[PDB]
Structure 1
Amino acid sequence: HHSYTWTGALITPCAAEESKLPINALSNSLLRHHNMVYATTSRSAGLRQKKVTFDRLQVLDDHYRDVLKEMKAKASTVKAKLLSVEEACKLTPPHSAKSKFGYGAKDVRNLSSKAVNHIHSVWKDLLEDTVTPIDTTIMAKNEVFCVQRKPARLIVFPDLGVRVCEKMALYDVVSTLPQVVMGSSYGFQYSPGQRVEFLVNTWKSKKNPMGFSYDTRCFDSTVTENDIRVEESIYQCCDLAPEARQAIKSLTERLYIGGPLTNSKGQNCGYRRCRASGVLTTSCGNTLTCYLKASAACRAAKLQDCTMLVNGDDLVVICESAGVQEDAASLRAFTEAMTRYSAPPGDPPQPEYDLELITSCSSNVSVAHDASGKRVYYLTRDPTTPLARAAWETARHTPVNSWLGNIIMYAPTLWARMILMTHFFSILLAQEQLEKALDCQIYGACYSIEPLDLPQIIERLHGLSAFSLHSYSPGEINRVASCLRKLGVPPLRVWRHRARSVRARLLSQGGRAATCGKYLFNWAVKTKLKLTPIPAASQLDLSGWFVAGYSGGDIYHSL
């Protein structure tokens, strides 16, 4: 029951890979400790293969089946529809990996004949064949981090034609099934603000609150064939068209359960018997599986008034404390149950009695104050990785602008406002590209967003208070201060001086650019403005922004 079997062939890159942080004339204005930033490459692929390769053992008890039965009952109320080839094509990212059959992403979005014809042949084959493993490509992810160096993560994905087929049969399912089965526990249905709200209300709903995050060690690798088949049995509970049931069964048997691994050179690298990270059901499957195992584990551990929040492989549990020693015992029992379910922890879980100290989804709840001096809760995170990626994007253009996504998700934070907003708006001003739409990701989905709409986006998602937060917590202030010293980022006085310049320039620009200066940089000036609700700013269609997770799903949503 090994997660992977290897042949010995190496995981090759598709081109040259840079490990050192690229430097240009703008780098030093953001940070000076360039040696602290690096990017993972295929050169470390071997190290990752060792960590992700191991034998899995599963002991499934009654709690597990009782939870699965309840999950299935809820899934049976779901009615999903098949997506036409056209609709599926439109969900394909403009920069999605080209097919090895004579066409690319652009060809798919344009609904070219060759692309559409090939997609129809793949679909037909899925209906006719339900046993032949489908080929997948394995690549070493190139991600930017700050030294503490971690090995590159592994990405496994099927051909573009197959991906479009996954959308046709499962897009509607993975988009609606999760919330129905897990209810309020499904994390991707919440925007950052609503997530905070849910956590805070949950924490206050307990007499003596106790919470903990559970970090599964290489979750994808802990996912067994049983887990993948159980997920399928849940999808099959929905009301689906016969053709959709057939495709789902075929995709599960031939793709989700496992398959051969081919490198960028076309060589056989090995065989996968666990979760593929680059398929449409990756986020939905991991979420359902984590929720199932964790729910059963909560019962085995006999936790009191248990409330969970699950986002893919990320999990947070808040319950009623029964004392320090008792909680420590309940946690060990939880971890033992999870281990039996094939979900061992990377780092032993610890009980927390302070909400702000619980980190889930690489984030945590913190508190600040608005203009009225009223306490306001918001979502934050350690800014180390966001700033490292910002430094990289400062000297190199990339498919996804993490800085943009971070400003949107973390607009209320001290670091996003002082540094990210200031630094990038300065750059956009100098290049006169304020109106140039840029791609970023939100819950795994790719979006094309115009920087000039940030004020409206921020007010809608975080409220006007996001433009006037002050008096951040001691812990938050210290974490940010720590990051700035580690990377060598200029102090507040410097960013304030720069923000004043950026603000003045935006104001003169008038229109949306003026709104950006007024709201985004109101913290810069000494005599803050009243900050009245933004005028005509409610046109963007943000309805599908926080519906579900799509990490690795190759999903693109049009604004």
Structure 2
Amino acid sequence: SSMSYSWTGALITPCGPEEEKLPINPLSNSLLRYHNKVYCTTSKSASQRAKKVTFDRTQVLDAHYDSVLKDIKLAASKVSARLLTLQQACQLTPPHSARSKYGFGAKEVRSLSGRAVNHIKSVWKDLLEDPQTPIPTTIMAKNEVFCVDPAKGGKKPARLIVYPDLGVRVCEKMALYDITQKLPQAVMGASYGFQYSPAQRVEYLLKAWAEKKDPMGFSYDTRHFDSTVTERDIRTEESIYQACSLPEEARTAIHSLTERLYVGGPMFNSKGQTCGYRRCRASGVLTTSMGNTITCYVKALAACKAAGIVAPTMLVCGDDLIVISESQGTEEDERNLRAFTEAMTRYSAPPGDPPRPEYDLELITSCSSNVSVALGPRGRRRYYLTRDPTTPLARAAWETVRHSPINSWLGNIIQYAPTIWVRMVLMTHFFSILMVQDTLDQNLNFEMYGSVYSVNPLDLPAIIERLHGLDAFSMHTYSHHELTRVASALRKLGAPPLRVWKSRARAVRASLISRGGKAAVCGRYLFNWAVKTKLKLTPLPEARLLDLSSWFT
């Protein structure tokens, strides 16, 4: 049937300058040495990406799908959702959002300037009146940082981002923001992934694992998911939205947004030229996460049913999927997973790597992360979330005139505090840098799901206790997989090995202790792993007085 894209041959041009690394990286050249391996994806590679995502979709649904969609619509119908005022929507626009072509930006939008509010009213009127004219979008290459991998062909090409003008983005929120806050949870319940912190993700996967008489687990990811999403998938997303009770004005805007924007349209580069035409998901519109997550849930749950997965418990995050089910023996389990993949492929959600049954929770990876296990202060097993540190290490070394990597360090320290690589490497480096800068008590921003939170380094111990438990400060005897992977990643980026970080950590610890105050608590709590005379660590008062629930919505 449909191509995902067509192209005019016009290039995908840059936003402005694409930052160069420098001959000296003063914040990160004591963390690792192989700076050559660390690179940013640029618009030069946008052509290579285009080729790899332009292809013809043919989708074939069936009774399992139909049955699943039916049940999801019913679940949707228990949701009521409101329009947002034009003003509420303006004020959910992030502070640095790309400016409009009509001479105003996000500052004006957030402060409700008259010009801006005016334009947005006209845009909304035109949405309510015209349910048809395709709405033009800009296409840009995303800039992300990775570590070169020769096993996977050198350097990844940039992914493509497609979005409408700022004025339309605000209208999207008016129509659909309230739904994005409610529909996912209503349709998927406990399966909805973005509701959990690391420790909760872990606790959920463990409960799920323990409930089975004889468990089996697998993970799934769709190759180039946005480009596999069909016009029909998108219209089916509308039906799911429409199954909620909504003021009629929302219904009309939602429908018009679907037909003029979501199902497809023309794409312009940043130089203004016509670039191509799209008949798949624009990753850039408001409904990108909600849609990806819901359409993935629909297909996946259908696939489980097509393939005989018994007693599936799921966890879904965009196109990333884990299912833990009752094993039917390894012979049947392997056949079933092939059926699953076959069904998903029919549903136009083909895999990057074919999935595989597993029978040990450590070997299942999803959202680039996995559960692992260590021993706690009293010798009991302690389960926690970790990941390959390669990319976090690479981003820890992205330093330019306009980008400091310190926020990156902080974000990882908080998400992955119980990991051996955060504790020994990133924490040691982070504290060492800030002490020498004398900026320990200065606040930093922590980025997560589009939100930023001001955090003070001297509060890490409390935040960590709240978020991960007091055991995060006392875990030992990490697993073989985990020690192997960390050693290997440090070697690959030319970073000192763990032994050395242990020395550096003893020094950082002592400096912190000698400053007394909150700094000394950082020294005792965060670096107790680093000394022979291991102190007794007690619950922190400041911790009890703390609410971090919004951090992981």
Kindly state the Cα deviation for residue 354 of structure 1 after the two structures are TM-superposed.
Answer: 1.3
What SS does the aligned partner of 1:138 have?
strand
The question of 1:351 aligning with 2:357 is answered yes
Match of 1:177 among 154, 175, 183: 183
Alpha-carbon displacement from aligned partner over 1:340-369 (angstroms, at most 9, x marks no partner): 100111111111111100001110000011
Please say which of residues 351-360 and 121-130 is displaced more in the overlay: 121-130
Q: Which of 146, 150, 153 is equivalent to 2:156?
A: 150
Q: Distance in 2 between matches of 1:452 and 1:231?
A: 45
Q: Per-residue CA shift, 1:464-522, capped at 9, x if unaligned? A: 11111111011101010110111111122322333333334444555544433332222
What is the aligned partner in structure 2 of residue 76 from structure 1?
A: 77
Distance of 2:22 and 2:317 partners within structure 1: 31
Tell me what 2:461 maps to: 455
Q: Secondary structure at the match of 1:502?
A: helix
Distance in 1 separating the partners of 2:125 and 2:323 = 44
Deviation digits for residues 519-540 of structure 1 (CA, Å, limit 9, x no counterpart): 2222233323322111123555
Code of the residue aligned with 1:107 in structure 2: it is E
- Paired AA for residue 350 in structure 2: P
Q: Which residue of 2 aligns with 1:389?
A: 395
Per the alignment, residue 100 of structure 2 pairs with: 99
After TM superposition, give the deviation of residue 281 of structure 1 in Å. Answer: 1.0
Identical counterparts, % of pairs: 74
1:199 corresponds in structure 2 to 205
Q: Work out whether residues 368 and 472 of structure 1, in 8 Å CA contact, stay in contact via their aligned partners in 2.
A: yes
- TM-superposed deviation, 1:136: 1.3
Match of 1:299 among 302, 305, 310: 305
- Between the aligned partners of 2:211 and 2:118, the Cα distance in structure 1 is 55
TM-score by length of 1: 0.93
What is the rounded CA distance, in whole Å, between the counterparts of 2:443 and 2:83 in structure 1? 31
How far 1:177 sits from its partner (Å)? 1.0
Structure 2 residue aligned with 1:420: 426
Cα gap change, 1:264/1:394 in structure 2, threshold over 3 Å: closer, same or farther? closer
> What TM-score do the two structures reach when normalised by structure 2?
0.94
The one-letter code matched in structure 1 to 2:498 is L
1:280 aligns with 2:286: yes
What is the aligned partner in structure 2 of residue 118 from structure 1? 119
The aligned runs of 1:123-142 (5 Å cut-off) are 123-142=124-143
Alignment of 1:214-293 (within 5 A): 214-293=220-299
Deviation at 1:311, TM superposition (A): 0.4
**Cα distance between partner residues in 1 of 2:202 and 2:436:** 36
Residues 365 and 377 in structure 1, CA contact (< 8 A), matched pair in contact too: yes
Does the C-alpha gap of structure 1 residues 22 and 266 become closer, same or farther in structure 2, counting only changes over 3 Å?
farther
Change (3 A) 1:312 1:271: same
Which one is further off, 103-112 or 48-57? Answer: 103-112
- 1:328 is matched with 334
**Partner residue, 2:14:** 13
Contact persistence 1:304–1:320 (CA under 8 A)? yes
1:555 alignment partner in structure 2: none
- Among residues 186, 190, 205, which one is paired with 2:192 in the alignment? 186
* Partner of residue 482, structure 2: 476
For 1:418-445, what per-residue CA distance to the aligned partner results, in whole angstroms no more than 9, with x for missing partners?
1112212222233333344433432344
SS in 1 for 2:158: coil
Which stretch has the larger CA shift, 437-446 or 300-309?
Answer: 437-446
Instruction: Indicate the SS of the match to 1:184.
Output: helix
Residue 505 of structure 2 is matched in structure 1 by 499
Could you tell me how far apart the structure 2 residues matched to 1:397 and 1:540 are? 31
Tell me how many residue pairs correspond in the alignment: 547
Q: Distance in 2 between matches of 1:270 and 1:530?
A: 63
Residues 178 and 39 of structure 1: is their aligned pair in 2 closer, same or farther, counting only changes over 3 Å?
same
Give the SS at the match of 2:549: coil
**Structure 1 contact 399–439 (Cα < 8 Å) conserved:** no
User: Partners of 1:448 and 1:266 in 2: how far apart?
Assistant: 37
Q: CA contact under 8 A between 1:56 and 1:342: conserved in structure 2?
A: yes
Q: Is the 8 Å Cα contact of residues 26 and 395 (structure 1) preserved in structure 2?
A: no
**Does 2:412 match 1:406?**
yes
Q: Could you list the per-position Cα deviations for residues 391-435 of structure 1 after superposition, in whole angstroms to 9, with x for gaps in the alignment?
A: 114886259933222222111111112111221222223333334
CA contact (8 A) 2:22 2:400 kept: no
Asked if the contact 1:19/1:40 (under 8 Å) is kept, the reply is no
**1:550 alignment partner in structure 2:** none
CA contact (8 A) 2:491 2:497 kept: no
1:428 counterpart letter in structure 2: L
TM-aligned CA distance change 1:203 to 1:273, over 3 Å: same
Amino acid across the alignment from 1:328: E
1:77-113 Cα offsets, whole Å, 9 max, x none, are: 1122222233323322222212222222222222322
Gaps of 5+ in 1: 548-559
- Relative to structure 1, is the Cα distance of residues 526 and 121 closer, same or farther in structure 2, using a 3 angstrom cutoff? farther
Contact 1:400 1:439 in 2 (8 A): no
Q: Deviations over 1:309-361 (max 9, x none)?
A: 11001011111111222111101111111011001111111111111000011
Q: Distance in 2 between matches of 1:239 and 1:435?
A: 49
Deviates more, 1:445-454 or 1:253-262: 445-454
* Partners of 1:55 and 1:321 in 2: CA distance: 35
Distance in 1 between residues matched to 2:469 and 2:351, nearest whole Å: 37
Amino acid at match of 2:256: S
Q: What code does the residue aligned with 1:51 have?
A: K
SS at match of 2:30: helix
Look up the match of 2:152.
none
SS of 2:25's partner is coil
Q: Mind listing any 5+ residue stretches in structure 2 that lack a counterpart? A: 150-154
Deviation of 1:161 (Å): 1.8
Choose 204-213 or 329-338, whichever is displaced more: 204-213
Q: In the alignment, residue 11 of structure 2 is paired with which amino acid? A: L
**Is 1:159 equivalent to 2:160 in the alignment?**
no
Between 434-443 and 259-268, report the one with greater CA deviation: 434-443
8 Å CA contact retained: 2:215, 2:327? yes
What one-letter code is carried by the residue in structure 1 that aligns with 2:71? Answer: E
Tell me how large the CA RMSD over aligned residues is: 2.0
